[PDB]
Design a protein around this ligand. Structure first.
Ligand SMILES: Nc1ncnc2c1ncn2[C@@H]1O[C@H](COP(=O)(O)OP(=O)(O)OP(O)(O)=S)[C@@H](O)[C@H]1O
Ligand SMILES: Nc1ncnc2c1ncn2[C@@H]1O[C@H](COP(=O)(O)OP(=O)(O)OP(O)(O)=S)[C@@H](O)[C@H]1O
Ligand SMILES: Nc1ncnc2c1ncn2[C@@H]1O[C@H](COP(=O)(O)OP(=O)(O)OP(O)(O)=S)[C@@H](O)[C@H]1O
Lengths: 424, 422, 436, 117, 187, 105
């Protein structure tokens, strides 16, 4: 509103619009829908009746995140401005305290800043007195349910008044929410509309990608060979291999069916080809191009593959010495949770059960940093350090006790992969 | 480059603190740990550096005279604008409220407000903050010490004045929680038996030759014109013996030596002669009686009445007597070391009616002395100290050791050692 | 000469990295990781990208050192082009961090050329409307310990900034730095779907040769300042090229236990400031005997020098204190059980031969220091609470262990009996009592 | 606790200070600035009413906090220990490092309603 | 009384057995191993001549100078047959490398040798239970059946009745417990 | 377990090498190809199987096979029939079955 005038600055020194820059502009998550096409009507025809008849209803939709329920209801009200209402985005998680939404409503009727106490008095005074038109979105309803349900009873008791000019639209995480958190007295007021949103399917996940790739798929750019700048000296084209787009779809529809996850894995795979193109020619920052299948093979795996295995083999020696002692106790006792003094008891013992071999150059260093002057250390060198280093890494976990002997230690990652990474 | 001082036994540690501190901020490391137990003179050896370095500027804070972190932020912000007033008095100032801050954001909010008007200075000057006693803060936790580490980096790094820290703490189990931050530490070792005595002689000659208790005893006895060196010898003979007859009792302390001297000194003064000033060995043989006793304890026959005395003597019985054995051995027809068991009500009067000399039946005064004994904290409740009256589930227990029971048994002529049988 | 001291000026600020930003030196074992960070960060400002990332690696891993290095690398040429907002998860709670953002916003506006005024949720929708909405100012977020924001209960502040990726015309970039490795499972579903899923792991010194290559680039000065420099540079590598040299020998120890450079970087700072002439410094890195004294002092009072610095009685109490501790099943022991077996130990010494057996009223004064030397612990005593409100819940709680007297607080053991035999020399008379 | 034993006690003298005097923080900050906050110097006295019911480690940690006030020289401290009985019990409970702090100038005055009748 | 034992266990894993299969097929790479001479390997005829010269020309003495490292090498296995084996091991270490006097470093490796050459829950519970059903049997025998029954009776650590059979066999054969009858079980 | 017998030995590996040499000797070739080892391993696994009584192209081929019935069958007799006429062995496609199962196709 105000400060966007101050967020503008002047000197914009000719940023290089490369080949893959114009992809990510439309691969931004902003800018009729194919997948939830008919269900848009099922909201709207439920909404169009109450709007043009001055009533008060409730609409309940659910589903996993990434299915358009943030998007679709915005498209409902957007066309309605063409044809009497006040649009508010009452987000649940964007309220600091749960009562703070009450302030917004009384602010968004006349422009006053009053109590969550004093708001809901005048709100109740509004909802049963006004002679005769308010659209409210109650987003992310896991936030506003937590304390004692006294807030949630209000937001549907206002719907019961026949003289209440309000239209509520609830969007939750799960259909189960008025059956495993709310009471039945709320569950009578929630109704039984219950419009379910499923996931997306992999065919439609192809049909959502090309909507972003409408005017740019297999099109042509005008490029100077000196700076790498592209314009919608050569006239190059850039093509997108649809089969790699398909294998992006057949995974994301399989695991999650999330519309952000489908776009972003294409967005991550787009910039892999960006740096490899910049690697071969170096246009910096101041014949026919494509994106291979091998890009989305890596980037989809890049969502999965870890490093704690690679982290463990790149740790210190006494770190790998520590875990090897720790699995030795877990196969000695079978109790998966060993006392800290017994580990210090073991790393002493794991010196001399090996022979008089490298182990001696270890055993010299393991109790003194050379320096035969100062010696005879009880616990090993930096034993507080590696145990602190294994703690904040999340691999280990150690309960709090002022005794530094009988405080228990519990593993936090799978102990087999700890056994498996130890083998290297 | 800096002008190092010199002290008695910190010859390595004066070098590192001269190493890890410069007036230039870039060479100066951010955070620092001076660690050691109480009895090493770290507050001594730190200030002893600072008196030899008038070029730098030190702001001295004291956490032990505070109680919490919420005033501790108010302690910091009040003092830097107090100090920078006395360092650059030409610089004009919008003085802020140090009472206003209570949260760890508000400090760096206000230090963003403080330092910006001081930007016009000529060179990058550092400013050393000193916290003394960070472990004995009485509301400490895990997530306070790291909260003060990163305060430097939230500051703008390009300001003309840079605030850096030095932390004084003890109880080295605490430092082992934060070794992964790898801030530079200078540990301070404990002492040995000679250097305790060596520190103590060069610190207590300035009072024990100038005390009037000597100066009275100078003119009271036939004063030979004994030298200050002759006063120095008997002072040194005192110190070199008092640490010898007490070192096993006190450990390697300095504070616990600084007061035991000031208890046994005038009692040592009275037992000198005119002649034993030249005779030190026989002087110890005449003043022997204080050198084998502690004299730090400033055994009561207890005030309580007779029926309350038998009320105590029945309460000690259920430190070993279980309900499986007691009703057999106390018919009307070893855990001496161990922690006491838990009572209930009316088991007292079960044992009290038995062991009293039909001769008694009225129990109003017997009920009087119970909560009399509750105010003496000799028998206390297991639970909180509130609802113990109405018989809900309330368990009781003694808090008196065996010896005070043993004297109070014979004080009422009652025999107790028979009924304790391992 | 001051030229030797001028070399101390150069070498010290090289060991702290406080040079001007043109000559800050990054070690070779992470040069790839800063460039992919650079490819993230410089196309976010110049090419107006709106993408986030999470830095993940252990403590003291140059993570905050890398990011402001990029900013200083961009502060020289892109001055007004961007502003930075830096938040620590340590210094900011969940709710004051909203006031943390807005107050750090407005002070940038006077540097680039009514916001903090109102309630906490009043200013919250303000920065929502100021962010969601010639060229546009881009904003870089610097988040230290973003895992603590990722708690179980609310996770509000993460949810707003990650949606600012999706909708805002203002180009942003988010930089999470943490050390909890599996950060992605710590998030819930609805926040992770907002997240662009790209994390980058921080490298470690994977070979012994790597940090050897690092310390060479660390200590070597390349710019001409002192006459000593050309002499000083070849002395460094000659110690480093020899695998039998002591500096090369002691670096191998640092590769073994710590395998972390700023630990070793800490050791050199007194070693190069303790010299007073040029030739002494060259002998110091040739001898490296100061590193022995340094590792002596870092070790001198954790547990062993605690034990060596006690008198005859304090040993004798503790030696008895463990011989009681071996008997019970949990190992707990009272004060009366200590002094009883301490009595017969002294009686055994006189009967086998003149040692002052002390009283009851004095051992307490020795017993006081032993518990605050942490050689014992209380039986059920959670030492340090993690945060403030868990510690405040322990302060109001009246305790029962103080309500039993001093000589019956069931003290347990920190240092076990069998380990005492290995540290106590056989020359001491109580050596027969270490073993049972 | 240690905390509210400090905080209520600083509050209790502060209103007693303004009433004789004719915004601030309730901790030891007032104790040094009492020369400047109220002009004349300070000699406070501590009527510990029922001393044996208190957890003594709180009392022992309390008196170390009062030990830090000994470096301002315009304030004088005086402690009154109204025990019920059993002085030998009290030297058992405290830390021995603080008994040596206590034993400088102690006075064992007896106050009993029944004293030799 | 055996002088030297050898744990020649495989313990199969990666980056080991791969080199094993590669070295076994490397002489299958060529039809004839004529390329066996360009490596650090002595021939057989030179080896037996050096061995026959060393066995009949060197009488090494075990001096008192290697006393201190032997005592401590014995107590580590003690915390006389091992001592008699290690002195012959140390004199064979002295037999090689043309030495007439034994040296202090030569026993270090010898001990490493015998320490690298050699590098309970089940039966415990077993006996435990046996004891139990004994007790609850008025000491009468535990049945095969009831044994198996209580022993699989716990889901946690899966004692398979075959494994059961085996460990049982062990203890009995270890003489700890007695079991009789093909169709029955005795505690 | 219950249906197990023996373990893998190096003599079985030497016998597999000898059977591959015999298969190359029966084809009168001077070299051992990839077709003999995949036949010998199939032989030694089907010798015990009676008790129960280079990848992207293959994936593309599988997709082509699907472009008819849309069937995700576990074991194949008519998917492999379009592979042998091209040039790849029976072992490469055998890995393509298992790998890809990670694609859940
Ligand atoms: N059918 C669609 N057509 C076009 N764009 C879509 C479609 N579905 C989702 N998107 C885009 O993907 C984003 C995903 O956001 P939504 O799915 O609307 O949010 P969501 O499903 O409510 O998940 P939440 O908000 O965390 S519960 C949208 O903001 C759009 O930018
Ligand atoms: N080298 C020294 N020369 C002279 N006096 C010394 C020396 N070292 C220590 N002292 C004395 O030791 C005393 C101990 O002072 P402190 O600094 O309080 O001891 P501490 O170990 O710091 O305990 P604190 O105060 O709880 S941190 C000082 O007051 C000095 O008088
Ligand atoms: N102002 C600074 N200039 C240069 N280097 C710095 C600065 N502050 C810290 N460092 C370096 O930062 C390194 C420590 O790594 P950091 O990233 O700061 O800490 P970290 O553990 O890696 O991440 P943090 O700080 O714990 S969230 C050390 O090598 C310091 O020399």
């Amino acid at each position: 509103s105000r400060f966007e005038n101050k967020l503008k600055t002047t000197q914009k020194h000719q940023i290089v619009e490369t080949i893959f820059s114009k992809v990510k502009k439309q691969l931004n998550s902003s800018y009729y829908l194919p997948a939830r096409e008919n269900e848009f009507a099922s909201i709207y025809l439920s909404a169009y009746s109450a709007i043009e008849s001055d009533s008060a209803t409730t609409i309940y939709v659910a589903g996993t995140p990434g299915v358009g329920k943030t998007l679709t209801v915005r498209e409902v009200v957007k066309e309605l401005l063409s044809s009497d209402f006040l649009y508010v985005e009452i987000n649940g998680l964007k309220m600091v305290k749960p009562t703070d939404c009450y302030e917004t409503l009384w602010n968004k009727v006349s422009g006053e800043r009053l109590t969550w106490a004093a708001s809901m008095e005048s709100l109740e005074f509004y909802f049963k007195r006004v002679p005769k038109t308010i659209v409210v979105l109650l987003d992310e309803l896991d936030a506003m349910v937590t304390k004692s349900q006294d807030i949630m009873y209000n937001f549907f008791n206002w719907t019961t008044y026949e003289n209440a000019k309000l239209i509520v639209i609830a969007v939750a995480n799960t259909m189960d929410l008025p059956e495993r958190q709310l009471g039945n007295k709320i569950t009578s007021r929630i109704g039984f509309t219950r419009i379910m949103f499923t996931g997306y399917t992999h065919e439609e996940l192809k049909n959502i990608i090309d909507l972003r790739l409408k005017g740019l798929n297999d099109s042509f750019f005008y490029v100077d060979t000196k700076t790498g700048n592209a314009i919608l000296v050569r006239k190059v084209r850039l093509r997108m291999s649809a089969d790699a787009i398909e294998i992006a779809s057949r995974k994301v529809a399989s695991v999650s069916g999330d519309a952000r996850r489908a776009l972003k894995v294409c967005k991550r795979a787009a910039e892999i080809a960006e740096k490899h193109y910049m690697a071969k020619h170096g246009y910096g920052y101041d014949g026919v191009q494509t994106v291979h299948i091998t890009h989305v093979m890596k980037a989809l795996n890049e969502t999965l593959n870890s490093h704690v295995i690679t982290f463990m083999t790149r740790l210190s020696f006494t770190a790998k010495l520590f875990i090897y002692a720790l699995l030795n106790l877990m196969k000695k006792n079978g109790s998966q949770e060993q006392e800290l003094g017994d580990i210090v008891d073991e790393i002493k013992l794991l010196i001399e059960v090996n022979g008089s071999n490298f182990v001696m150059e270890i055993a010299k260093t393991l109790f003194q940093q050379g320096s035969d002057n100062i010696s005879e250390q009880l616990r090993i060198i930096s034993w507080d350090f590696v145990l602190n280093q294994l703690l904040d890494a999340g691999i280990l976990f150690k309960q709090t006790m002022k005794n530094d002997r009988i405080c228990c230690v519990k593993l936090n990652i799978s102990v087999e992969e700890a056994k498996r990474a130890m083998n290297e | 480059n800096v002008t190092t001082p010199e002290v008695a036994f910190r010859e390595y540690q004066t070098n590192c603190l001269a190493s890890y501190i410069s007036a230039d901020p870039d060479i100066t490391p951010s955070n620092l740990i001076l660690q050691g137990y109480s009895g090493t003179g770290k507050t001594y050896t730190l200030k002893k550096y600072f008196n030899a370095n008038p070029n730098l500027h030190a702001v001295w804070l004291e956490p032990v005279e505070l109680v919490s972190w919420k005033p501790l932020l108010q302690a910091i912000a009040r003092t830097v604008q107090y100090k920078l007033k006395t360092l650059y008095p030409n610089i004009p100032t919008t003085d802020y409220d140090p009472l206003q801050v209570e949260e760890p954001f508000l400090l760096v909010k206000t230090l963003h407000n403080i330092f910006v008007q001081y930007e016009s200075l000529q060179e990058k000057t550092c400013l050393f903050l000193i916290l003394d006693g960070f472990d004995s803060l009485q509301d400490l936790d895990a997530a306070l010490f790291n909260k003060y580490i990163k305060l430097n980096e939230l500051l703008p790094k390009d300001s003309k004045i840079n605030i850096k820290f030095i932390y004084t703490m003890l109880e080295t189990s605490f430092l082992q929680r934060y070794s992964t931050h790898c801030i530079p530490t200078v540990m301070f070792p404990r002492y040995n038996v000679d250097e305790v005595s060596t520190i103590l002689v060069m610190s207590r000659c300035g009072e024990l030759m100038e005390d009037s208790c000597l100066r009275k005893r100078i003119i009271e006895e036939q004063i030979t014109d004994c030298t200050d060196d002759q006063f120095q010898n008997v002072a040194a003979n005192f110190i070199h013996l008092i640490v010898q007859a007490f070192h096993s009792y006190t450990g390697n302390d300095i504070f616990a030596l600084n007061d035991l001297i000031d208890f046994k000194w005038p009692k040592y003064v009275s037992r000198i002669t005119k002649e034993n000033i030249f005779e030190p060995l026989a002087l110890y043989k005449s003043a022997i009686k204080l050198f084998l006793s502690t004299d730090d304890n400033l055994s009561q026959t207890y005030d309580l009445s007779i029926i309350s005395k038998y009320l105590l003597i029945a309460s000690y019985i259920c430190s070993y007597l279980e309900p499986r054995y007691d009703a057999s051995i106390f018919s009307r027809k070893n855990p001496r070391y161990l922690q006491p068991s838990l009572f209930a009500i009316e088991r007292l009067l079960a044992i009290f009616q038995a062991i009293f000399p039909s001769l008694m039946k009225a129990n109003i005064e017997v009920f009087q002395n119970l909560s009399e004994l509750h105010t003496l904290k000799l028998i206390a409740t297991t639970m909180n100290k509130n609802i113990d009256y109405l018989s809900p589930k309330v368990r009781w227990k003694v808090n008196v050791p065996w010896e005070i029971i043993k004297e109070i048994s014979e004080s009422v002529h009652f025999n107790i050692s028979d009924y304790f049988s391992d | 000469d001051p030229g030797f001291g001028s070399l101390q000026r150069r070498l010290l600020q090289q060991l702290y990295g406080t040079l001007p930003t043109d000559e800050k030196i990054i070690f070779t074992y992470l040069q790839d990781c800063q460039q992919e960070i650079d490819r993230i960060i410089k196309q976010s400002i110049i090419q107006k990208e709106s993408h986030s990332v999470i830095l993940v690696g252990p403590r003291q891993s140059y993570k905050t050192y890398l990011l402001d290095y990029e900013l200083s690398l961009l502060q020289q040429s892109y001055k007004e082009q961007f502003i930075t907002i830096r938040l620590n998860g340590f210094i900011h709670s969940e709710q004051t961090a909203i006031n943390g953002i807005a107050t750090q916003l407005e002070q940038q506006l006077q540097k680039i050329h009514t916001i903090s005024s109102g309630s906490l949720t009043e200013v919250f929708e303000k920065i929502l409307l100021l962010l969601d909405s010639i060229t546009k100012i881009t904003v870089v977020f610097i988040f230290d310990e973003i895992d603590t924001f990722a708690g179980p209960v609310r996770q509000t502040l993460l949810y707003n900034l990650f949606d600012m990726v999706e909708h805002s015309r203002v180009p942003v970039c988010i930089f999470g730095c943490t050390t909890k490795l599996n950060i992605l499972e710590y998030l819930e579903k609805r926040v992770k779907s907002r997240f662009s899923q790209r994390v980058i792991y921080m490298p470690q010194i994977q070979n012994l040769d790597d940090m050897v290559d690092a310390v060479r680039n660390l200590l070597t000065v390349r710019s001409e300042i002192s006459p000593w420099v050309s002499q000083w540079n070849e002395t460094l590598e000659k110690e480093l090229s020899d695998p039998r040299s002591n500096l090369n020998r002691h670096i191998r120890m640092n590769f073994e236990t710590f395998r972390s450079l700023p630990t070793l970087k800490n050791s050199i700072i007194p070693l190069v400031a303790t010299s007073k002439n040029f030739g002494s410094l060259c002998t110091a890195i040739k001898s490296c005997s100061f590193l022995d004294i340094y590792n002596k002092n870092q070790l001198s009072n954790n547990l062993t020098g605690r034990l060596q610095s006690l008198s005859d009685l304090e040993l004798a109490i503790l030696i008895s204190a463990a011989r009681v501790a071996l008997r019970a099943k949990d190992g707990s022991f009272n004060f009366n059980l200590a002094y009883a077996e301490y009595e017969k130990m002294i009686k055994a010494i006189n009967s086998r031969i003149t040692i002052k057996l002390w009283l009851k009223k004095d051992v307490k004064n020795v017993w006081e220091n032993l518990v605050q030397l942490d050689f014992f612990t209380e039986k059920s005593a959670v030492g340090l609470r993690d945060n403030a409100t868990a510690a405040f819940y322990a302060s109001n709680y009246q305790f029962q262990g103080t309500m039993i007297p001093f000589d019956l607080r069931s003290y347990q053991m920190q240092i076990i009996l069998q380990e005492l035999r290995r540290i106590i020399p056989k020359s001491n008379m109580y050596y027969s009592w270490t073993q049972l | 606790n240690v905390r509210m034993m400090l905080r209520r006690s600083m509050y209790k003298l502060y209103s007693a200070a303004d009433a004789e005097e004719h915004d601030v923080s309730y901790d030891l900050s007032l104790v040094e600035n009492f020369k400047r906050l109220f002009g004349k110097d300070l000699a406070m006295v501590f009527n510990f009413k029922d001393v044996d019911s208190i957890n003594f480690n709180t009392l022992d940690n309390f008196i170390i906090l009062l030990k830090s006030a000994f470096k301002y020289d315009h304030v004088k401290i005086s402690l009154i220990f109204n025990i019920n009985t059993n002085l030998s019990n009290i030297e058992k409970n405290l830390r021995q490092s603080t008994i040596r702090l206590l034993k400088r100038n102690y006075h064992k005055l007896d106050v009993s309603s029944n004293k030799g009748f | 009384r055996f002088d030297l034992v050898y744990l020649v266990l495989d313990k199969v894993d990666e980056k080991n057995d791969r080199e094993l299969a590669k070295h076994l097929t490397n002489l299958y790479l060529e039809d004839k191993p004529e390329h066996i001479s360009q490596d650090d390997v002595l021939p057989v005829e030179f080896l037996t001549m050096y061995i026959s010269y060393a066995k009949e020309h060197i009488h090494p003495i075990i001096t008192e100078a290697a006393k201190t490292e032997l005592v401590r090498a014995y107590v580590g296995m003690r915390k006389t047959r091992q001592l008699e084996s290690m002195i012959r091991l140390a004199e064979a270490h002295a037999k090689m490398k043309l030495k007439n006097v034994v040296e202090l470093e030569d026993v270090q490796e010898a001990v490493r040798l015998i320490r690298s050459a050699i590098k309970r829950k089940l039966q415990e519970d077993l006996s435990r239970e046996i004891m139990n059903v004994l007790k609850d049997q008025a000491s009468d025998s535990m049945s095969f059946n009831e044994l198996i029954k209580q022993i699989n009776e716990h889901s946690q650590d899966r004692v398979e009745s075959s494994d059961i059979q085996e460990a049982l066999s062990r203890l009995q054969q270890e003489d700890k417990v007695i079991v009789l009858g093909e169709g029955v079980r005795r505690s | 377990s219950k249906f197990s017998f023996g373990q893998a030995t190096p003599r079985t590996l030497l016998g597999i090498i000898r059977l591959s040499q015999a298969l190359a000797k029966l084809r009168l070739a001077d070299m051992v190809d990839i077709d003999d080892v995949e036949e010998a391993l199939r032989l030694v696994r089907v010798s015990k199987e009676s008790l129960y009584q280079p990848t992207t192209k293959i994936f593309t081929i599988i997709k082509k096979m699907l472009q008819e019935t849309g069937k995700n069958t576990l074991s194949y007799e008519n998917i492999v029939k379009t592979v042998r006429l091209r040039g790849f062995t029976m072992l490469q496609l055998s890995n393509c079955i298992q790998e890809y199962s990670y694609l859940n196709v």
